[PDB]
Design a protein around this ligand. Structure first.
Ligand SMILES: CC(C)S[C@@H]1O[C@H](CO)[C@H](O)[C@H](O)[C@H]1O
Ligand SMILES: CC(C)S[C@@H]1O[C@H](CO)[C@H](O)[C@H](O)[C@H]1O
Ligand SMILES: [Mg+2]
Ligand SMILES: [Mg+2]
Ligand SMILES: [Mg+2]
Ligand SMILES: [Mg+2]
Ligand SMILES: [Mg+2]
Ligand SMILES: [Mg+2]
Ligand SMILES: [Mg+2]
Ligand SMILES: [Mg+2]
Ligand code: NA
Ligand code: NA
Ligand code: NA
Ligand code: NA
Ligand code: NA
Ligand code: NA
Lengths: 1011, 204, 193
């Protein structure tokens, strides 16, 4: 039969899809959502055997355990147990494209379980097995008898086992196929794994049972009144004595309740549904649900007899909220949303694709703490608990069908094909049947990167017809097709158009106004956070706030998909594509998250938190105007803290309670600003703090911040009469300067400061030299490759230009004595294949105070690619415990990604100045620094810097962070200017013009002195 | 050109057509017809089938065709003759001036139907003037309305030819048989003969 | 597998649908819609035997003619040949409503044909069989080997027989079921044949 190579067969004997059931036999347990005795978990230790193909599976396995099998935990992905390699491929299918066939060598996991079944479950009622997740297709046998088959690795497959079980011990056998015709619709950009990876359960239902229930909530014009409508269907023998009661609870208070016998209204010439009934309940002044205040009620649906005996009860959490698109705006409860979203795959570094509650909670909390209010289920229906958590903690969810055919050519080859309609329809229809009662789901998605075909149009209308309560979106085919209610592009930029043929990505501001366009625009993916990224993030947020119809987006993406590997010594390290011998693969493209696989944040996360803040501020005089971007709640768990400091030194501060209605404003007068005693720049910082803990944050959580410069008093105070005058000693090879116990040496042939001593201690391992390059970021590399260079990527432009190969040529090296100092003057050219790339002119003035003033004027040829940086670098001989600076921080920040950082005096251990991106690159810069302290050294100016135990050379030569080794000393990069990091996308040049170093001539100055 | 989908005997009529599990099967009936017949100029309108109520499957399929072949309108009478799955109001047996206000699926007078609040589609009866036996009384009343009202664009009489079958007597002589004459039961007797012409094509 | 009681299986190994083809190898012929040597009719005299249920059909029939069979003209409705009664029901289904199952007693028509295929057809290219109308579902075998299955009594079902035929004589075996899950979608007010 080879059902796994026939898209016309997506299952055999599988039961209908439906919302989460537990078959409680006590209404109160249903109301309180307690564990039901009728819903058993079969998770735990199973038996498992790996085979190279289904043909190799022995028939004996159907009836008995194979002795060579191992005992393993289920749910699991068999790759995470080492049976075979997980593969990381992005677009290209992991199997040859020859639909609907799959390789003959098709890894097959044989799982089995011996378990008991109580006679009470068999004597009456129906016992079914439910597999919430099997990747990618499977056959099921019970007690050696075949039961059925199922596909769609992302939704539950259920089978009735009533006639196959016997009281006592029973055996289940599951043959799981890694590949199947289903794989053609599962080409998402993630690790390709397989197995029984989601829960396995047994559910007992009465023969006369609730077989489906739909709950809807409609409102009057101002949401002050609602009608709860619950349509209930039954299976079994209809009897006049049957009844349905639907009751609605708000905590312990019964808000409403209604009962009726079965028998729906007339539908057509043939009548109505005798096996269904609709209950309608009136609710006055309902508590509305939103991500802001996730108010929930509990709906309990009881199937019972007239006399009152309960047959069974089902239930769900209900959130009263309306989602509609009107006048081109996505409204929730009549207010336009601003989606602060993120795409989140289900990934664990140890367990692969198996999800657990702990991890889900951890994620949700971090999300909320970081000012996210929405999540897109990229790109398949999630483990069921996810929705329950979003409903309760409050997150808007985009639920997305498990359909992705990115690897086809062209992309809609299958989706425009009627033969694939059935398979696709199941992926959509079964998702809706399962999740439609969850308030957190506000928008349905037809899948991802599958082009646009007629099948989409068919399914878009199906959904609109069955569930008018939620908009439908879909990005394929150009983001604004007839299959989407929302313009939902991926990586369209804010101002810049990318006019690709057929499926252009217009600037989002322009897209809204194309002739005839009226829909809202919410990016389904934007700001690709791969490595050191998120540059330009503030530009999106500024546009979102200015344009009503720009209603936000989902960052790509939440968490890095790295997997743990163990070295020779058993130590763990983070692996990416290719690290399992998987080939071909897409290397580091699987790590695009705001957080590391273990949940530790990347620096980008703070930039997202700040730009996604819910309070905006303005300053005028001593007036701070706070505006609330909340749509529904008042600021009843917030205080405003303010502090004024002079170059890092606290002068004053205070706190004022925040009392702003949704969308309102509050004016706070700051008190009289006592002058200050000292030159310096005064800075005002404000922070919004939540005094009380909440379900998702601890007391004291900071939810918003902003800074402003206040007055500045330039220093007009002429120094002092230097105690001494440095001495210059000239020799054929060098210019030496001595002053007290310090000495500086300038080599006359290289033209650089090659050594500096404090007493008899050398302070340098490598001379101080100009640096114009950086160890390329993921964004600089883009898709360029060794075996296939992308000439357009920044890294390739710089390579080709000779930037990493150019060598300094001396032009001038002179020494002069002035009245109280010695002045060294130098000039160098950097050339490549006879072309002058850069010219650096400097002066070093060493005075009686021991301060060394460095002036740098650089020329950059106009025709060379704009350089990554214009700075100096050196390897210091020493290593020190801390790094202290007055500049932006505390975390890593770059020119196009520094809004979240604050100007202040920061002090961290050296290691925190290094960002352990899995794929190493330039990292840890801090910009806007006026003073930097390390060991006995102090550098003053207006620069950007990074400091760590790793040379740029090392970072660029090293593929994985676990392979980096601390070098001797400390490498310090101090930049007058540094290029933006980009990130609009990571497969093309993405650094905005304004962040490129294209001025041609640059000047910067620094003072190096001893502390 | 009409899809081979009719589920008249279900209770209610859209039991299967509103069931996603029957979407695939229905889908092949509509898609394979369009793929086969879309180059014939004589086909001017596609129909989703007949007397199968109105279910979400219809909506999906109506959209499918609109997407693949914009060149022809799509009609479907199920569920009231004026649902979201039809470009043309295409009732069966709606009368000229007299309303028949059945619950859920009324059959309004055709003149009145055109102008119900918000209605703007053309109206062409998919079936009218049931020519069973000595019939066709009131035919001229339809025609007078069709000519007076722009949006009343005609209709398809029910139907062309009697579905009578030939049987042979004891003497071997032939005779026209109907429902129940083959031992078939239950059966609907003479309801199978509704045509303007006899089974041999002689006109009534 | 009782494919005829499962709406999830409406065909097996069936070729994609498409507009009328004739594969002319002369363009002039195509211009004038003349008969094509590449489009052959299998209409005429076939072998047929009636059974009360699919379970009653003998395996032998897959490989050789049943001597009991009769010779009849195809196309035809077997009711018109007297093998069983045609039924005239308007709305009410002719079988009990219990989707997607059908009666156990399900009249089965076993059709077969021995026909010649020239080597020229097999040396190059693809040879497919086209059944323009089979009511209501059927399985097909060619030279004793199973080929595929089809539903929808009103559209053509096509199968690639390239790998199943041999030069000279060949034998098709078609088992046609009167009722199937497809009958649930075929309740038109007309004789049921
Ligand atoms: C590399 C582009 C041509 S496709 C690009 O790849 C990304 C890599 O993380 C994501 O998967 C995006 O969804 C996809 O559009
Ligand atoms: C008799 C009605 C309830 S159904 C009525 O029966 C007719 C009889 O010829 C036709 O089949 C019609 O299409 C059908 O609407
Ligand atoms: Mg299959
Ligand atoms: Mg993709
Ligand atoms: Mg590769
Ligand atoms: Mg009768
Ligand atoms: Mg079938
Ligand atoms: Mg010829
Ligand atoms: Mg022979
Ligand atoms: Mg009918
Ligand atoms: Na906006
Ligand atoms: Na990726
Ligand atoms: Na407050
Ligand atoms: Na690197
Ligand atoms: Na008219
Ligand atoms: Na009739």
């Amino acid at each position: 039969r080879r059902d796994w190579e026939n898209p016309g067969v997506t299952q055999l004997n599988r039961l209908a899809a439906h919302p989460p059931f537990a078959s409680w036999r006590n209404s109160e347990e249903a109301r309180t959502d307690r564990p039901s005795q009728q819903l058993r978990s079969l998770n735990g230790e199973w038996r498992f055997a790996w085979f190279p193909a289904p043909e190799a599976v022995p028939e004996s396995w159907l009836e008995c355990d194979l002795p060579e099998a191992d005992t393993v935990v289920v749910p699991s992905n068999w790759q995470m147990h080492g049976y075979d390699a997980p593969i990381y491929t992005n677009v290209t299918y992991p199997i040859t494209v020859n639909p609907p066939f799959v390789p003959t060598e098709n890894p097959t996991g044989c799982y089995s379980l011996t378990f008991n079944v109580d006679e009470s479950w068999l004597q009456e009622g129906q016992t079914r097995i439910i597999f919430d997740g099997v990747n990618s297709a499977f056959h099921l046998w019970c007690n050696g008898r075949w039961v059925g088959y199922g596909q769609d690795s992302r939704l539950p497959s259920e089978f009735d086992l009533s006639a196959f079980l016997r009281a006592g011990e029973n055996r289940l056998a599951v043959m799981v196929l890694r590949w199947s015709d289903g794989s053609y619709l599962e080409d998402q950009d993630m690790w390709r794994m397989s197995g029984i990876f989601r829960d396995v359960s047994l559910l007992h239902k009465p023969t006369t049972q609730i077989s489906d229930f739909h709950v809807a909530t409609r409102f009057n014009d101002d949401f002050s009144r609602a009608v709860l409508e619950a349509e209930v269907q039954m299976c079994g023998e209809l009897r006049d004595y049957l009844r349905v009661t639907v009751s609605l609870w708000q905590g312990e208070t019964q808000v409403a309740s209604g009962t009726a016998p079965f028998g729906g209204e007339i539908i057509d010439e043939r009548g109505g549904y005798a096996d269904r009934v609709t209950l309608r309940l009136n609710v006055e002044n309902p508590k509305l649900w939103s991500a802001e205040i996730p108010n929930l009620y509990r709906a309990v649906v009881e199937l019972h007899t007239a006399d009152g005996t309960l047959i069974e009860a089902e239930a769900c959490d209900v959130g009263f909220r309306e989602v509609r698109i009107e006048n081109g705006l996505l409204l929730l409860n009549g207010k336009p949303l601003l989606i602060r979203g993120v795409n989140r795959h289900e990934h664990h570094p140890l367990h692969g694709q198996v999800m657990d509650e702990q991890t889900m909670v951890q994620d949700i909390l971090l999300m909320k703490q970081n000012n996210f209010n929405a999540v897109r289920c990229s790109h398949y229906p999630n483990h069921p608990l996810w929705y329950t958590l979003c409903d309760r903690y409050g997150l808007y969810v985009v639920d997305e069908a498990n359909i992705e055919t990115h690897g086809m050519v062209p992309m809609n080859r299958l989706t425009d094909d009627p033969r694939w309609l059935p398979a696709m329809s199941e992926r959509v229809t079964r998702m809706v049947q399962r999740d439609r009662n969850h308030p957190s789901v506000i928008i349905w998605s037809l899948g991802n990167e599958s082009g646009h075909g007629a099948n989409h149009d068919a399914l878009y209308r199906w959904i609109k017809s069955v569930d008018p309560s939620r908009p439908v979106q879909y990005e394929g085919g150009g983001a604004d097709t007839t299959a989407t209610d929302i313009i939902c592009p991926m990586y369209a930029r804010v101002d810049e158009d990318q006019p690709f043929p057929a499926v252009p990505k217009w600037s989002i501001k322009k897209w809204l106004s194309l002739p005839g366009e009226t829909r809202p625009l919410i990016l389904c993916e934007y700001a690709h956070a791969m490595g050191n990224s998120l540059g330009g993030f503030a530009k999106y947020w500024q546009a979102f706030r200015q344009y009503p119809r720009l209603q936000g987006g989902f960052v790509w993406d939440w968490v890095d998909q790295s997997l743990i590997k163990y070295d020779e010594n058993g130590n763990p390290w983070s692996a990416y594509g290719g690290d399992f011998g998987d080939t071909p693969n897409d290397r580091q493209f699987c790590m695009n998250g705001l957080v590391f696989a273990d949940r530790t944040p990347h620096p980008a996360l703070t930039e997202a938190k700040h730009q996604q803040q819910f309070f905006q501020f303005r300053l005028s005089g001593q007036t701070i105007e706070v505006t609330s971007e909340y749509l529904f709640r008042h600021s009843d768990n917030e205080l405003l803290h303010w502090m004024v400091a002079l170059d890092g030194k606290p002068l004053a501060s205070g706190e004022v309670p925040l009392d702003v209605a949704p969308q309102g404003k509050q004016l706070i007068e700051l008190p009289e600003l006592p002058q200050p005693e000292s030159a310096g720049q005064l800075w005002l910082t404000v922070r919004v703090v939540q005094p009380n803990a909440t379900a998702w944050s601890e007391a004291g959580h900071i939810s918003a911040w902003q800074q402003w410069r206040l007055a500045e008093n330039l220093s007009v105070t002429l120094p002092a009469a230097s105690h001494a005058i440095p001495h210059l000693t000239t020799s054929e090879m060098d210019f030496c300067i001595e002053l007290g116990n310090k000495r500086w040496q300038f080599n006359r042939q290289s033209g650089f400061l090659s050594q500096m001593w404090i007493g008899d201690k050398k302070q340098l391992l490598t001379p101080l030299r100009d640096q114009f390059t950086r160890a390329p970021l993921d964004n600089d590399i883009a898709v360029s490759e060794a075996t296939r260079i992308d000439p357009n990527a920044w890294v390739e432009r710089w390579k080709a230009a000779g930037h990493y190969q150019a060598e300094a040529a001396l032009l001038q090296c002179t020494a002069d004595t002035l009245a109280d100092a010695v002045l060294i003057t130098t000039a160098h050219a950097w050339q490549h294949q006879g072309k002058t790339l850069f010219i650096s002119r400097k002066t070093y003035r060493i005075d009686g105070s021991g301060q060394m003033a460095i002036t740098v004027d650089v020329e950059v040829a106009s025709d060379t690619p704009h350089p990554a940086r214009i700075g100096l670098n050196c390897q210091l001989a020493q290593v020190a415990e801390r790094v202290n600076w007055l500049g932006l921080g505390p975390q890593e920040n770059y020119p196009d990604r520094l809004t979240a950082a604050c100007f202040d005096r920061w002090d961290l251990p050296l290691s925190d100045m290094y960002t352990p991106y899995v794929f190493p690159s330039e990292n840890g810069l801090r910009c806007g620094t006026r003073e930097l302290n390390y060991g006995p050294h102090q550098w003053r100016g207006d620069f950007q810097f990074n400091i760590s135990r790793y040379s740029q050379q090392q970072l660029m030569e090293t593929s994985h962070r676990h392979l980096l080794h601390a070098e001797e000393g400390t490498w310090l990069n101090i930049d007058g200017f540094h290029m933006g990091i980009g990130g609009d996308d990571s497969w093309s040049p993405s650094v905005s013009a304004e962040f490129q170093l294209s001025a041609g001539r640059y000047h910067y100055q620094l003072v190096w002195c001893q502390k």
